[PDB]
RNA sequence: AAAUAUGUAAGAAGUCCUUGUUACUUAAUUGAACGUGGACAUUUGAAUGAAGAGCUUUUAGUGGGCCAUUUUUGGUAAGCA
RNA sequence: GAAUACUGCCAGCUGGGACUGAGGACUGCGACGUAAGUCAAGGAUGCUGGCAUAAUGGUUAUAUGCCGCCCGUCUUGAAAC
């Protein structure tokens, strides 16, 4: 019973088919991302050419970052922040956009900054600060074996599969999002850009919905 | 901030009783898209019975200046709230573009009447196509034939904390 | 024992994602788009330039 | 001194209403309650017997006992830091069936009908309710709907 | 030497420390307060049902 | 700062590694913590948790309870397991030929069991006979039969046994207990 | 006649079919309540989160409070009540 | 018919600076290689100089920069005139 060569070679081969499946899946995801965004651009161009207006779909995903600290919070926004898992300043979470979640975001408007994340900032968040919740422990991802062990029941095999499930809000978004530990970001590297934070972003402050400017803030804080 | 001009076109949400609402359009000076859409919904809530939950925005487009290197005279009609009431004013500004003209307008109102961005309403801004329709002396002063003037008392800021000669303010 | 970070450290980047090698090979980060000659309508441009 | 009687602060609560005073109609006597029905409590000031207390006005409970002219209802009352169980004997003029329960039962029977008809094909029934999703892409046209430009209106007195 | 008369300050915090736990509901709730003419017949009905089931699965 | 949703640093509240200083009990919990770690049978974890228990959480199990448990059908040849002590009962007259594994046996219970043809077995012999609890039956004594739980939760309209030293007439049978003297509870 | 607060429901202890008990009830196997047997399972019946869930015993200290935003009472007012 | 600005992306390249080197046979995931093997791939190694002593360091006194109200108690509140 040598047991160090045959099983090792079988394990290496099995990893080779796993790597091939991950490679072709990522090729398909890249193709569908670029065709989707180019189709949106061409649809806007054709609407302009025909003289109509192209109203694009409302975004189905937000990223929410807690901005205010933990002292002096009223109980209803405090409970909503605990239910959205924002128990620390500079902590972020993806939220699927629904009326039921928009009412929570309206409740905790003065203590968060949220917006519509892009593929680049989602990829940078999961790649740099990527932590899974494995039997109530915070485990860094760092290898696809962890992700296919814990989310492989729901089809997710790799980190880019998890990224795809986040960005295209699929059938198992809830499972993927609860598998993801809340993101612990730092303070922004270039500052907040405003002299005073706790006004609305429309008022020249920081809280509220900076609907597409959240990518700059999150990339500075990440 | 440094202002940009947008057109914002929106409408009410379509119902079965009335599809195709009337697609209202407005021109907003704002820092970005979020502030532009917020000001759009603010003025439509002042005008018609609609709000953001009951309506939608079909288009937002930046309108940059057609001739950004032509020197124009603009007449601007403005509402502002003072500490005791609401007043209408007409000010005219000689400047090269609409966004810069309304930037100097906001600075002028904040300087001379202590009126804030939340208090100023921009009724309209329009280029005055003909001279002698200019009605203010402070801009009619710069429309004379062969305008030239000197700049007395030049002050040159120094980089060193010590200067080795008495400076001159000749220009 | 130590979290090595992708987006630097191309070894662990290739460990997580095999597609990154052919992404860098084909240069899909800088991909040239196909040009279309569509022109907007006159009603669109006059609505844009309307005062 | 202070006054906390049984019907204190019940003035507008136990007024009848505008222009529907007088005797009560016979549907409240013809309605049938069974044990386990879920009922709303709203007192009728015209009937002084079997009246609920002012706490239970607008409360919803479960029938546990049926007698000759009254109904026993179970309410959960918050006392301090827990809920206690309260049993009330109320005449049937002060109760009516809760409509949310019958709406939910209609959803149950229509849901079972959908599952039963779609079990013959296996077409991913998707029986859970979903909330208001964000509205998707659309193309709005300007044929007969050219945009109208609006401006803020100047100030006037209007008196 | 007057003093504070009454307040409800801190009371909801004290309540929500250990929560407002909902009471535990059970299958077969208590039959006290139910009508005695109903219970007197219900006893005989269950006795006959138990005898019939015992004779069926004896 | 963290907005804590729970109490930090709290113990689990479940007793491990029992408070007794009995060296043979420590040997037994060593054997059964090995078995619970590696035999992946739920029986070993159950008896390992039962080995930690205090005296009032280990009530005695009578031979009448053992015989009543053996009269369940399909359970005549099972091995009875009592993590605790086994006392006898003179209220029963016939006893089957069982095997009973327990911590302690009283003299009467051991005499009854070996007189009926059965056998008394310790927990380590139980472990070497059935490492994964094959064909066993765990019995537990009645916890709520103690004298102390009579007075637990005493209050009005509870019927819950006042803490009293002397009983009889004129020892708490008066005002507050009959309506002829004031009220009734 | 609002806004904010507030009760209940969103299933398996459920739904449907068939027929057993009774001293209750009905003109009447009519109904009431509890049942036998059978069918419906992971989108099992909205969202989000769960950090374990539930239960018991015993005992300490405390039972002078005060301040801020908002609502508000007496007072001309108060760092007043 | 172009350019440029603005915004955004690159699993594009590359220069300078600071702090950290935890762990201690091997095991894992990978990469470059046909292969042997190699590697920046589950945490620092290689080369060199000076000194080998009060030189670094410890202790203690002093000086300097910034900070620091008297303890215990009652109290809503104590450095309390
Ligand atoms: Mg504040
Ligand atoms: Mg600041």
Short mmCIF file of C-alpha atoms in Angstrom, two decimals, chain F:
data_model
loop_
_atom_site.label_atom_id
_atom_site.label_comp_id
_atom_site.label_asym_id
_atom_site.label_seq_id
_atom_site.Cartn_x
_atom_site.Cartn_y
_atom_site.Cartn_z
CA UNK F 1 -17.04 49.52 18.14
CA UNK F 2 -19.42 46.69 17.29
CA UNK F 3 -23.19 46.80 17.65
CA UNK F 4 -23.45 43.46 19.42
CA UNK F 5 -26.61 41.46 18.83
CA UNK F 6 -25.73 38.92 21.53
CA UNK F 7 -23.90 38.65 24.83
CA UNK F 8 -20.16 38.44 24.21
CA UNK F 9 -17.93 35.79 25.81
CA UNK F 10 -20.78 33.77 27.32
CA UNK F 11 -20.31 30.16 28.34
CA UNK F 12 -22.36 27.51 26.58
CA UNK F 13 -24.11 26.66 29.84
CA UNK F 14 -23.88 22.90 29.31
CA UNK F 15 -21.78 20.97 31.79
CA UNK F 16 -18.78 19.10 30.41
CA UNK F 17 -16.09 17.16 32.34
CA UNK F 18 -18.12 16.35 35.46
CA UNK F 19 -17.65 18.17 38.74
CA UNK F 20 -17.06 14.92 40.67
CA UNK F 21 -13.51 13.90 41.55
CA UNK F 22 -14.18 10.19 41.10
CA UNK F 23 -11.21 8.69 39.28
CA UNK F 24 -13.20 5.74 37.92
CA UNK F 25 -15.84 8.14 36.60
CA UNK F 26 -13.05 10.12 34.93
CA UNK F 27 -11.77 6.90 33.34
CA UNK F 28 -15.30 6.15 32.12
CA UNK F 29 -15.73 9.60 30.59
CA UNK F 30 -12.30 9.23 28.95
CA UNK F 31 -13.40 5.95 27.33
CA UNK F 32 -16.71 7.37 26.23
CA UNK F 33 -15.28 10.64 24.95
CA UNK F 34 -13.02 8.53 22.72
CA UNK F 35 -16.06 6.54 21.59
CA UNK F 36 -18.15 9.67 21.01
CA UNK F 37 -15.35 11.30 19.04
CA UNK F 38 -14.70 8.39 16.71
CA UNK F 39 -17.51 5.81 16.55
CA UNK F 40 -19.98 8.31 14.89
CA UNK F 41 -22.94 6.65 16.73
CA UNK F 42 -25.41 8.87 18.62
CA UNK F 43 -25.56 6.45 21.57
CA UNK F 44 -22.01 7.28 22.67
CA UNK F 45 -22.68 11.03 22.63
CA UNK F 46 -25.89 10.50 24.61
CA UNK F 47 -24.19 8.44 27.32
CA UNK F 48 -21.21 10.82 27.36
CA UNK F 49 -23.55 13.72 28.12
CA UNK F 50 -25.39 11.58 30.69
CA UNK F 51 -22.10 10.80 32.45
CA UNK F 52 -21.62 14.50 33.26
CA UNK F 53 -24.96 14.87 35.05
CA UNK F 54 -25.44 15.69 38.73
CA UNK F 55 -27.26 13.56 41.29
CA UNK F 56 -30.73 15.09 40.94
CA UNK F 57 -30.41 14.81 37.16
CA UNK F 58 -29.64 11.09 37.59
CA UNK F 59 -32.74 9.72 39.32
CA UNK F 60 -32.73 6.02 40.25
CA UNK F 61 -34.31 3.59 37.82
CA UNK F 62 -36.27 0.74 39.35
CA UNK F 63 -36.32 -2.88 38.23
CA UNK F 64 -40.07 -2.42 37.78
CA UNK F 65 -39.33 0.30 35.21
CA UNK F 66 -36.81 -2.03 33.57
CA UNK F 67 -39.41 -4.82 33.34
CA UNK F 68 -42.05 -2.39 32.04
CA UNK F 69 -39.60 -1.24 29.36
CA UNK F 70 -38.87 -4.86 28.43
CA UNK F 71 -42.58 -5.57 28.02
CA UNK F 72 -42.56 -3.31 24.95
CA UNK F 73 -42.78 -5.56 21.90
CA UNK F 74 -39.60 -6.16 19.96
CA UNK F 75 -37.60 -5.09 23.02
CA UNK F 76 -37.34 -8.36 24.94
CA UNK F 77 -33.68 -9.08 24.11
CA UNK F 78 -32.33 -5.54 24.25
CA UNK F 79 -29.67 -4.46 26.74
CA UNK F 80 -31.02 -2.01 29.31
CA UNK F 81 -28.71 0.95 29.92
CA UNK F 82 -29.04 3.18 32.99
CA UNK F 83 -26.50 5.96 33.34
CA UNK F 84 -26.99 6.11 37.08
CA UNK F 85 -28.14 3.72 39.77
CA UNK F 86 -30.61 0.83 39.74
CA UNK F 87 -32.74 0.10 42.81
CA UNK F 88 -35.04 -2.86 43.25
CA UNK F 89 -38.79 -3.01 43.85
CA UNK F 90 -40.65 -5.48 46.02
CA UNK F 91 -43.92 -4.45 44.33
CA UNK F 92 -43.03 -6.66 41.35
CA UNK F 93 -42.86 -10.42 41.68
CA UNK F 94 -41.51 -11.85 38.42
CA UNK F 95 -38.48 -10.53 36.55
CA UNK F 96 -37.15 -11.52 33.11
CA UNK F 97 -33.68 -12.76 32.11
CA UNK F 98 -32.27 -9.42 31.02
CA UNK F 99 -28.88 -7.78 30.86
CA UNK F 100 -28.60 -4.39 32.57
CA UNK F 101 -25.60 -2.08 32.28
CA UNK F 102 -25.36 0.64 34.90
CA UNK F 103 -23.05 2.71 37.06
CA UNK F 104 -24.24 1.34 40.40
CA UNK F 105 -26.54 -1.45 41.49
CA UNK F 106 -28.02 -1.72 44.94
CA UNK F 107 -27.65 -5.07 46.69
CA UNK F 108 -31.34 -5.87 46.28
CA UNK F 109 -31.34 -4.96 42.59
CA UNK F 110 -28.22 -7.00 41.84
CA UNK F 111 -29.68 -9.95 43.77
CA UNK F 112 -32.99 -9.67 41.89
CA UNK F 113 -31.31 -9.44 38.49
CA UNK F 114 -28.91 -12.34 38.97
CA UNK F 115 -31.63 -14.41 40.66
CA UNK F 116 -33.86 -14.00 37.62
CA UNK F 117 -31.03 -15.33 35.41
CA UNK F 118 -29.90 -11.99 34.00
CA UNK F 119 -26.68 -10.10 34.51
CA UNK F 120 -25.34 -6.80 35.83
CA UNK F 121 -22.82 -5.09 33.56
CA UNK F 122 -20.60 -2.02 33.91
CA UNK F 123 -20.33 0.69 31.27
CA UNK F 124 -16.91 -0.44 30.05
CA UNK F 125 -18.17 -3.99 29.47
CA UNK F 126 -21.11 -2.37 27.69
CA UNK F 127 -18.57 -0.53 25.53
CA UNK F 128 -16.66 -3.69 24.65
CA UNK F 129 -19.88 -5.61 23.94
CA UNK F 130 -21.61 -2.91 21.86
CA UNK F 131 -19.19 -0.19 20.73
CA UNK F 132 -21.88 1.60 18.71
CA UNK F 133 -24.75 0.82 21.08
CA UNK F 134 -26.04 -2.24 19.26
CA UNK F 135 -29.44 -3.43 20.54
CA UNK F 136 -29.54 -1.12 23.56
CA UNK F 137 -32.32 0.74 25.38
CA UNK F 138 -31.56 3.78 27.55
CA UNK F 139 -33.80 4.30 30.58
CA UNK F 140 -34.11 7.44 32.70
CA UNK F 141 -35.70 7.97 36.09
CA UNK F 142 -38.40 10.52 36.87
CA UNK F 143 -36.83 13.94 37.41
CA UNK F 144 -40.00 15.79 38.45
CA UNK F 145 -40.85 13.42 41.30
CA UNK F 146 -38.58 15.00 43.92
CA UNK F 147 -39.89 16.75 47.00
CA UNK F 148 -38.18 20.00 45.99
CA UNK F 149 -40.09 20.47 42.72
CA UNK F 150 -43.37 20.56 44.66
CA UNK F 151 -42.59 24.10 45.85
CA UNK F 152 -41.26 25.37 42.50
CA UNK F 153 -43.37 28.20 41.14
CA UNK F 154 -45.48 28.78 44.23
CA UNK F 155 -48.08 31.50 43.81
CA UNK F 156 -51.80 32.27 43.75
CA UNK F 157 -54.03 29.78 41.89
CA UNK F 158 -51.09 27.46 41.23
CA UNK F 159 -51.71 24.55 43.61
CA UNK F 160 -48.01 24.29 44.25
CA UNK F 161 -47.18 23.11 47.79
CA UNK F 162 -46.05 25.85 50.23
CA UNK F 163 -42.67 25.58 51.93
CA UNK F 164 -43.71 24.60 55.44
CA UNK F 165 -42.14 22.78 58.39
CA UNK F 166 -45.05 21.69 60.58
CA UNK F 167 -48.35 20.57 59.10
CA UNK F 168 -51.87 19.99 60.34
CA UNK F 169 -54.66 22.22 61.52
CA UNK F 170 -53.70 25.86 62.28
CA UNK F 171 -50.60 25.64 60.05
CA UNK F 172 -51.63 27.70 56.99
CA UNK F 173 -55.22 26.51 56.44
CA UNK F 174 -57.00 29.81 57.10
CA UNK F 175 -57.39 33.38 55.75
CA UNK F 176 -56.21 33.03 52.17
CA UNK F 177 -57.24 29.36 51.84
CA UNK F 178 -60.99 29.16 52.56
CA UNK F 179 -63.64 31.72 51.74
CA UNK F 180 -65.10 31.60 55.26
CA UNK F 181 -61.88 33.30 56.42
CA UNK F 182 -61.43 36.13 53.95
CA UNK F 183 -60.72 34.76 50.48
CA UNK F 184 -59.61 31.56 48.76
CA UNK F 185 -56.03 31.92 47.43
#
